[PDB]
Design a protein around this ligand. Structure first.
Ligand code: NA
Ligand code: NA
Ligand code: NA
Ligand code: NA
Ligand code: NA
Lengths: 250, 250
């Protein structure tokens, strides 16, 4: 019985005042912690603000990226050590946008996952295949390799506590649309990979989120699929009213 | 009559409480703004804390990097619009470490400079040649090209208000050392390219910092160089006592 987890990725949106207003509007109105886990991945500029207002609530707080060293000569980078000290719960890593624009590799993601656990936090590891890979019938192999690479070297206990988010990158365009069948098939691809590398017992504990489009009238249907344990939500997490609406399924 | 500018680049160091304690120890002890401009480039996690503690002082506040769009689907990026909204003065762009680890290009830097001005802040534009380029005898040409690429499209008034930091990359972690002679030579190369592109009047206003090994014991000797207007200082800016000691040359 894996606990569902809806994480809202604000991406590069909101200043601290806007972030503050959002958390004040949502933190005290989330469903009970036993029913669903709810969190926000906020910009680094906004984190201390989000954490202060989220204090005493069930809203989990995630960073959108971090570097793989605790400190040093890495101008412009966010430390996982500092993230932990300020009270951050999760760190999103390997998001499609970072693997794209910012050249992040499987090796960087693996290093980040290790750094995040070394700093007592939990990673939300993103994966997903391109349109080209999808059209070539290679989604399962590509995603499988990504997942395996990211987890290599973690302990069984660390794997069991990780979150993995599957993004259907191929469905961003015009002529492609993802369905519940896609979410289920791809979330199972992730879990089977974890099973092959760490065993079925570990695989059955790791949460796998769907990162494709979910809406209030469909979120429940997607989450009810056997291998889908939550959602990494983009645009719909930017408004309090919209984010809260995605927690209705519980 | 170019006002000297010492900027302490903390790089990926300090949590918010550490950042607050530092500002508390240096804000009220800085020299008059008429003598020297003093700033701190702090991690994004610490910026709101630095800004609030520095409020009312003459301590300038800088970000260590930002993206070139105000908002959007850029997971993990720091917005220049939010940097302005919180009150940031400067943004360091093109630092050697980012051009290295994150493959940042001259095109990225040019877009960032424009974004920074569009948002009402000032850039600290970093440049500098590799050991290979240095050994090839092509330092002047290489650095000149970086400066020209970074400033292309900016107005003469924007260039006059910009800050450019020459980093002797060939003498950072290579077993080679750079001296006051290299600082003067290379800071003049920078100013000469500004003069060529925007006229000598503009060039005589742009502040060119040195980004090599500067310390309290030797800062005065570098500042005496006619074309050196400051320093973008790393390790020596982490301790309060040491940062203040970089400001006593006037
Ligand atoms: Na499910
Ligand atoms: Na300000
Ligand atoms: Na190096
Ligand atoms: Na050196
Ligand atoms: Na000088």
């Amino acid at each position: 019985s894996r606990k569902p987890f809806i994480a809202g990725n604000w991406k590069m949106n909101k200043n601290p005042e806007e972030a503050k207003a959002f958390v004040e509007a949502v933190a005290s109105k989330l469903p009970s912690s036993d029913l669903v886990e709810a969190g926000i991945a906020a910009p680094a500029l906004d984190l201390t603000t989000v954490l202060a207002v989220a204090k005493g609530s069930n809203l989990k707080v995630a960073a959108q990226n971090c570097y793989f060293e605790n400190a040093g000569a890495f101008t412009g980078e966010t430390s996982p050590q500092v993230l932990k000290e300020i009270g951050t719960d999760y760190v999103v890593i390997g998001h499609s946008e970072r693997r794209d624009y910012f050249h992040e590799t499987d090796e960087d993601i693996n290093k980040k996952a290790k750094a995040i656990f070394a700093n007592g936090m939990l990673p939300i590891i993103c994966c997903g295949e391109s349109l080209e890979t999808y059209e070539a019938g290679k989604a399962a192999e590509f995603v499988g390799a990504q997942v395996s690479a990211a987890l290599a070297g973690l302990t069984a206990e660390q794997v069991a506590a990780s979150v993995i988010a599957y993004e259907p990158i191929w469905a961003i365009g015009t002529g492609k649309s993802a369905s519940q069948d896609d979410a289920q098939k791809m979330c199972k691809v992730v879990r089977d990979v974890v099973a092959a590398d760490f065993g079925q017992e570990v695989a059955d504990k790791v949460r796998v989120q769907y990162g494709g489009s979910v809406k209030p009238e469909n979120v429940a249907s997607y989450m009810a699929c056997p291998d889908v344990d939550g959602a990494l939500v983009g645009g719909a997490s930017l408004e309090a009213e919209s984010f809260l609406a995605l927690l209705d399924f519980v």
